């Protein structure tokens, strides 16, 4: 169960990071491999944490729980890039591109903490790491989204789109976790493990495949 | 003492950060909006420190007392948003303003080392970093200076109070240091609690304020 | 041996750091400015990655060995400056040099990941981080250097040379970690410090000296 899907996460991240390799290499112009670029280590990044899930690195028992704590070096490093994809299809403001790339850091800063400290106090971090992730959640479906779309009058369904899916999955995530024995204890690992992968894969590679659609959207409207 | 100065700090670095915050939010052009929003995120980083440190996270006993380590990862975080305040009032060279944060991350790497390693080894470690804070107080009294005061002729003395005032504020941490239990032992960690937070408070809600008004001297010069 | 070359690497990257220093006050303009800026942060990364080292910090006995895991955290930060130095004086594509920082931190967590795991384990993300170093050769000798002489006609042997010098002191590194007690056990721990002390110094005073003369080919064919 819980190696199966890691072996799985290993494979599609790495299908993903080949595809985005390529059209990296015949990339059209410097937007388009700016994007494929992006995505490319988005996808590198999961498939190598993966990988190490998968060989049994990065898990350790806290709290009396198997916790794979290396998923938040994976997160720290691939989110942000996944912003990027917003920011720069949007062409964002740097104060509100620095914001949503803090807001983002101290998210799973403080998710980490949640996560490798025992309950109650963990609960304590989770509503921390919650109240940045409505943060971040104002900022996407307000102020970035206008922004985004005045700069981009005739493709305005295509930024409602990308907040959309982006908002829609990555809610996701919070409500895992308190599910999880992290939380709740509604299902253990195995559950949690399929979830988190088949999660990574449309944040990642969907989401992937979302952006790139969208510059193509963005430029057939010139 | 202790734990009074932890909570005192949340607090006021959260009313800090709503400040910070609402001004980004009303913020005027780009350039306030960028400089509300750095002041915010600096207040931010100290808020959930302040708030790990106060529930007891963060702090080791390390050769024989009690030592908040995540300290570290707070100022390696918010200092460099402090400079990045002094670089974009001042318009500063992209080689002058790399080098005050590759400055600072060496001051506060070796400064790490020097806190967690224990006597005499800590006092080598204590002078290389304060053998790159006062590279910084090089850099700052001199080249960054005079470049900013070129660029803005008639706003001198707002760039010789915003060098001074961090140079004073700054300058008492490698003090409290040496005199702290890290050093000669001259006071013990409730009088070390209550200087860093009244330090945090003037360096990063004092400072912040001094940069608004800075930016506002600047700008009603044009 | 192992403490004559970690002094050793210590006073020559000290060394280092004080030519880079002056070269960067009395800089011509800002190019030259960038330039001994960055070689400086280089050497005064190592240089103090050394100190750490000759003091016998950052080093642990894993698998049996003494191991400075510590060197990792030199070249984590170090060697992105190091590939800065060419896209800067190639004046590279955005997403050409992200991909070399990229591919370059990849290369290094999966290379400190293959330190610090027993064998086979270990051969496994020691050939994860050989093929994201291939991946870098590639970049290097093929996309960075055709739109780097495109960008510098009259200049193409410069080019040619950096990407050379760079390739080759930079596939020594993955040759003494395998012939290393990492891997066949060729040659004991005070070799292998001997090997990676004159290797940091060809690849940081070394190279630092090659990109300001670089600069110099450059300019002087304008
Ligand atoms: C590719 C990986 C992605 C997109 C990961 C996203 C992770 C989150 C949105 C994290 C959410 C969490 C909370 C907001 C509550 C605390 C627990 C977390 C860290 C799972
Ligand atoms: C908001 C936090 C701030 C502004 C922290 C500043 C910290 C320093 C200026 C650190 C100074 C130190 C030395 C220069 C000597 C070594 C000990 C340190 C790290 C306290
Ligand atoms: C100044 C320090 C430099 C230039 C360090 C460079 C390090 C490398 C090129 C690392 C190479 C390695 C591999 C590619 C295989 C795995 C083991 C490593 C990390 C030594
Ligand atoms: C993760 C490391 C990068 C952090 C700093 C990101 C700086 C982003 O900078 C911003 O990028 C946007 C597109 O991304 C552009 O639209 C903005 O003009 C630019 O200012
Ligand atoms: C902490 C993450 C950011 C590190 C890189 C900072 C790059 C700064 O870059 C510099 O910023 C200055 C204002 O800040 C500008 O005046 C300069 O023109 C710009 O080159
Ligand atoms: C290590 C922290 C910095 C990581 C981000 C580096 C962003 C580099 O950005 C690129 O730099 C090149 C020269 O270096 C320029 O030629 C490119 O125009 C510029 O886009």
Same mark, same amino acid.
């Given at each position: 169960?819980?190696?199966?899907?890691?072996?799985?996460?290993?494979?599609?991240?790495?299908?993903?990071?080949?595809?985005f390799?390529?059209?990296?290499?015949?990339?059209?112009?410097?937007?388009?491999?700016?994007?494929?670029?992006?995505?490319?280590?988005?996808?590198?990044?999961?498939?190598?944490?993966?990988?190490?899930?998968?060989?049994?690195?990065?898990?350790?028992?806290?709290?009396?729980?198997?916790?794979?704590?290396?998923?938040?070096?994976?997160?720290?490093?691939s989110?942000?890039?996944?912003?990027?994809?917003? $920011?720069? %299809?949007?062409?964002? /403001?740097?104060?509100?591109? =620095?914001? +949503?790339?803090?807001?983002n850091?101290?998210? !799973?800063?403080?998710?980490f903490?949640?996560?490798?400290?025992?309950?109650?106090?963990?609960?304590?971090?989770?509503?921390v790491?919650?109240?940045?992730?409505?943060?971040?959640?104002?900022?996407?479906?307000?102020?970035?989204?206008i922004?985004?779309?005045?700069?981009?009058?005739?493709?305005?369904?295509?930024?409602?789109?990308?907040?959309?899916?982006?908002?829609?999955?990555?809610?996701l995530?919070?409500?895992?976790?308190?599910?999880?024995?992290?939380?709740?204890?509604?299902?253990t690992?195995?559950?949690?493990?399929?979830f988190? $992968?088949? %999660?990574?894969?449309? /944040?990642?590679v969907?989401? =992937?495949? +979302?952006?790139?659609?969208?510059?193509?959207? !963005?430029?057939?409207?010139?």
């Amino acid at each position: 169960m819980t190696q199966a899907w890691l072996w799985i996460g290993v494979i599609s991240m790495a299908l993903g990071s080949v595809f985005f390799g390529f059209g990296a290499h015949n990339a059209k112009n410097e937007r388009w491999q700016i994007l494929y670029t992006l995505n490319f280590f988005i996808c590198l990044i999961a498939a190598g944490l993966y990988l190490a899930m998968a060989l049994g690195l990065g898990v350790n028992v806290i709290n009396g729980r198997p916790t794979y704590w290396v998923r938040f070096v994976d997160w720290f490093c691939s989110t942000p890039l996944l912003l990027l994809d917003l $920011t720069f %299809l949007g062409r964002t /403001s740097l104060p509100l591109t =620095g914001s +949503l790339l803090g807001a983002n850091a101290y998210m !799973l800063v403080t998710g980490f903490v949640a996560t490798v400290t025992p309950k109650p106090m963990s609960y304590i971090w989770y509503i921390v790491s919650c109240a940045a992730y409505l943060a971040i959640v104002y900022l996407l479906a307000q102020p970035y989204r206008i922004a985004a779309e005045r700069k981009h009058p005739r493709s305005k369904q295509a930024f409602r789109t990308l907040v959309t899916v982006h908002l829609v999955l990555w809610t996701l995530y919070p409500i895992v976790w308190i599910l999880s024995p992290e939380g709740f204890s509604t299902f253990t690992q195995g559950s949690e493990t399929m979830f988190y $992968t088949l %999660l990574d894969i449309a /944040s990642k590679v969907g989401f =992937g495949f +979302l952006s790139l659609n969208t510059l193509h959207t !963005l430029e057939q409207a010139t």
